[PDB]
Design a protein around this ligand. Structure first.
Ligand code: NA
Ligand code: NA
Ligand code: NA
Ligand code: NA
Ligand code: NA
Ligand code: NA
Ligand code: NA
Ligand SMILES: [Zn+2]
Length: 867
């Protein structure tokens, strides 16, 4: 029942706050906050100051040290009337970190106290202008028990400290950069601290401090290393240096999201900090690197230039995601990064864009802004930034970055400001391109071709449309950069030209329908279309199998080779799902299996690329091939396809598995790539002849000298239901039960198991010694993984998965609505399923709609879903 807010309602605030002096008298049960703000009236003389506040106990209100009588509290607010044009506001209020189970505001993480203020959490700390176009200079004094909280941290530099009576002490911090309150942070606790330094290119020496729970210093150096790598890369690639003297990171165990870019004092979920080779996989290492980079990158794209309002979230997030992908891609394998980001787009983001929650990357309407930290705003947002990069090229794109910062450094900006900077600096016209900000849904691009041997011309007829979405009945054509390459019979690229002039290979597809003609095409080409996934679109082209296997062999970009393989598999995934619905077993032409045999035996192919080709689309990517999802058929077909390839390629699989053995473990990209290939081979081998598979898998688990290899073996034992499974699963538990992060991997394998009794096991794990409903990571690794990553069990025909999720959400709605709203997502996809499943999913949603004290977070999603 809160009301929707609308982007078109934006208005400049009636009051600004320029400076705020905060004091916290910290205690888990009762913290007392004193906030002295210097305010200035911009609006009308008679306009009251309206402060946001949630669950605060107001103690006093003074204006220039006069106790104020002209105020009132209303729902979510303190409204203060009859004010001068400039004045000092002082508010004292109380809060209770220990009661804060939602983990928004000031809360408790184990024995630590920490904050999360984005999007609107600072209002849970004191009454404030909790909107990101109000930027203020903060000073923060923190008073606490010295033994319990020996480290008292906030943004910026320490400027004062003292000791008090009765075992208390205090520290005061000042951050010279004006900031919106969402970037405020405070941490209090007892930590081990890893300290290091980075010297910027101009010579600024930056102290780096990573704070971790006592005992975890053995797991901190990789995050420190990645922080230095991120700082170096931002200098080399974007020309950006860190702007303060200290960079602090705190790893906390209780955190709803991944991490948070609070200026000078980032707060991280420990999953994105803590690694050592026996606890963390290669993928953990690269996610640490990604996320460390991402928060660092926000220092410019988010902090030095922030968001005018929350509808502009993608201005920081699309651009910072783009930056983290570029970082990862530059340091590591660009092809593997691009592949993975495309898998995410097509299999997860396209599903959101086809859901009741569909929105443009710059939303128009929001009820609960924490619901809009989405695949769309992030991943599609980054694809839009990448399109700009495609249209401008690197040099002009960097000119646009520089112009963006020159204009907006020190302020809150809009998506439109950013696009204008890019357009003005490059002289590329982005007026049509802007529609990508305002239109939801995934465009479908249909391509037909014609080769004319009399004129040696090749013609592409390209059409686009975006189907209506629930949020938008009106859709219009976009400016779609559509990259192509044309290949002759020997696999060489044909120069693109027309009328004697070269033609850019990025075509501008701007109309509902258009034709493009290329001259001097001396041989009928095989096209590579939408190269490097040049726009976030569904491609419709009538490929032959042979065109696709030809691209798998000859395409110049590794991405195109993988993508061609995906298009080849899509045909046969669809075929086999229809078969499955008719009771018929898997059918695959011999020449398809041969294409994958060729990948395995090709000596020149990068193993990173080979590994991706040999990784089948996930059940989520497979679901996107279909209008109506049959999750049981998809799961069974994926397995049958794995078993068919395991049998047909058994000898080649074992040979490549053995050839990529590595005795040394290194977190190095060539090594990672070999190991990904070897483990991609193991997945198939696990589905071969049982006794061979069992031996191979058990052996890898017991001989692994690193968690990447041990987990790959354990996961294969679960997936193929091998005899060794229960023993290996018990061993892992017995060894790792005290380590939450490591047990998350195990809860995911339990939740995603193909066993017939998976729900009964998942329910039993609610009582496991390593599980707790108080920890978001545990919740997501057991309950989220079941609902979101085991659609076949979640969607069991008896409706048991939906009932289970309802029960869990009934708890989480009151305990932690943000995590609840993450976990409801699979139920809101009901219209993609068959009538009988829809009926049960609607019944489940209607039960949740009637919960007493329904959170705004759930209410928004439930009302869209039931419409
Ligand atoms: Na201000
Ligand atoms: Na001040
Ligand atoms: Na309130
Ligand atoms: Na690279
Ligand atoms: Na054709
Ligand atoms: Na054709
Ligand atoms: Na437990
Ligand atoms: Zn971010």
């Amino acid at each position: 029942q809160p009301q929707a807010k609308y982007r078109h309602d934006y208005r400049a605030p009636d009051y600004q706050i320029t400076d705020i002096d905060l004091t916290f008298d910290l205690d888990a049960q009762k913290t007392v906050v004193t906030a002295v703000s210097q305010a200035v009236r911009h609006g009308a003389s008679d306009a009251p100051l309206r402060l946001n506040g949630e669950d605060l106990k107001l103690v006093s209100v003074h204006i220039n040290d006069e106790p104020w009588t002209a105020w009132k509290e209303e729902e979510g607010a303190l409204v203060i009337s009859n004010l001068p044009e400039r004045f000092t506001l002082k508010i004292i209020n109380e809060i209770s970190p220990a009661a804060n189970t939602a983990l928004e505001g000031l809360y408790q993480s184990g024995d630590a106290l920490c904050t999360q203020c984005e999007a609107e959490g600072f209002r849970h700390i004191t009454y404030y202008l909790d909107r990101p176009d109000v930027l203020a200079r903060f000073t923060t004094k923190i008073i606490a028990d010295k033994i319990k909280y020996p480290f008292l941290l906030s943004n910026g530099n320490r400027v004062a400290q003292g000791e008090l009576e009765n075992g208390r002490h205090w520290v005061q911090w000042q951050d010279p950069f004006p900031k919106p309150c969402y970037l405020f942070a405070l941490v209090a606790g007892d930590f081990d601290v890893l300290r290091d330094t980075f010297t910027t290119r101009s010579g600024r020496e930056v102290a780096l401090e990573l704070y971790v729970d006592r005992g975890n210093l053995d797991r901190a150096p990789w995050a420190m290393t990645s922080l230095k790598n991120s700082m170096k890369w931002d200098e080399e690639r974007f020309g950006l240096e860190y702007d303060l003297d200290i960079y602090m990171i705190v790893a906390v165990d209780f955190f709803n999201a991944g991490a948070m870019e609070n200026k000078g004092l980032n707060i991280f979920n420990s999953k994105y900090v803590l690694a050592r080779t026996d606890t963390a996989t290669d993928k953990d290492y690269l996610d640490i690197e990604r996320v460390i980079g991402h928060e660092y990158f926000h220092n410019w794209t988010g902090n030095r230039v922030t968001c005018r309002d929350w509808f502009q979230l993608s201005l920081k997030e699309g651009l910072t995601v783009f930056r983290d992908q570029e970082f990862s891609s530059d340091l590591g394998s660009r092809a593997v990064n691009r592949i993975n980001n495309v898998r995410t787009m097509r299999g997860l983001q396209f599903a959101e864009d086809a859901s009741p929650m569909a929105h443009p990357i710059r939303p128009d309407m929001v009820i609960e802004m924490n619901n809009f930290y989405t695949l769309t705003v992030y991943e599609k947002g980054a694809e839009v930034i990448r399109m700009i990069h495609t249209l401008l090229g690197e040099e002009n794109f960097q000119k646009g970055m520089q112009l963006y910062f020159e204009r907006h450094d020190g302020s809150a900006a809009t998506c439109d400001d950013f696009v204008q900077a890019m357009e003005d600096a490059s002289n590329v016209d982005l007026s049509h391109f802007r529609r990508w900000y305002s239109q939801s849904g995934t465009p479908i691009v249909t391509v037909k071709d014609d080769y004319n041997p009399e004129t040696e011309q090749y013609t592409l007829t390209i059409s686009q449309r975006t189907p209506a979405t629930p949020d938008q009945a009106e859709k219009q054509p976009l400016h779609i950069p559509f990259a192509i390459e044309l290949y002759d019979n020997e696999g060489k690229v044909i120069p693109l030209q027309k009328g004697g002039h070269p033609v850019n290979s990025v075509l501008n597809v701007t109309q509902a329908e258009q034709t493009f003609v290329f001259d001097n095409v001396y041989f009928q080409p095989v096209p590579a279309l939408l190269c490097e996934f040049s726009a976030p679109v569904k491609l419709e082209y009538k490929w032959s199998d042979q065109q696709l296997t030809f691209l798998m062999r000859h395409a110049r970009n590794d991405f195109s080779r993988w993508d061609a393989a995906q298009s080849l598999l899509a045909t046969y995934i669809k075929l086999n799902v229809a078969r499955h619905q008719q009771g018929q077993p898997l059918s695959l032409p011999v020449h398809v299996a041969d294409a994958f045999r060729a990948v395995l035996l090709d000596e020149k192919i990068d193993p990173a690329l080979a590994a991706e080709i040999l990784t089948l689309p996930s059940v989520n990517e497979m679901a996107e091939l279909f209008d109506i999802i049959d999750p049981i058929a998809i799961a069974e077909v994926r397995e049958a396809l794995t078993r068919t390839l395991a049998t047909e390629l058994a000898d080649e699989l074992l040979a490549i598995y053995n050839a990529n053995y590595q005795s040394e473990y290194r977190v190095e990209h060539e090594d990672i790539a070999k190991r990904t290939l070897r483990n991609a081979c193991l997945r198939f081998l696990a589905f071969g002849e049982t006794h061979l598979a069992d031996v191979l898998v058990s052996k890898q688990f017991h001989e692994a000298n690193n968690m990447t290899d041990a987990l790959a073996a354990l996961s294969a034992a679960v997936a193929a239901q091998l005899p060794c499974r229960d023993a290996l699963m018990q061993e892992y538990d017995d060894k790792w039960h005290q380590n939450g992060l490591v047990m998350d991997k195990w809860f995911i394998l339990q939740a995603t198991s193909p066993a017939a009794n998976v729900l009964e096991t998942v329910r039993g794990l609610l009582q496991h010694r390593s599980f707790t409903m108080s920890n978001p990571n545990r919740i997501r690794s057991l309950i989220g993984a079941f609902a979101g990553s085991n659609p076949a069990a979640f969607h069991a025909e008896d409706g048991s998965g939906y009932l289970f999720l309802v029960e869990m959400l009934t708890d989480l709605n009151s305990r932690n609505p943000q995590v609840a709203s993450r976990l409801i997502e699979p139920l809101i996809r009901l219209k993609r399923y068959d009538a009988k499943r829809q009926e049960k999913m609607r019944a489940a949603l209607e039960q949740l709609k009637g919960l007493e004290n329904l959170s705004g977070d759930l209410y928004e999603k439930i009302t869209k879903a039931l419409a």
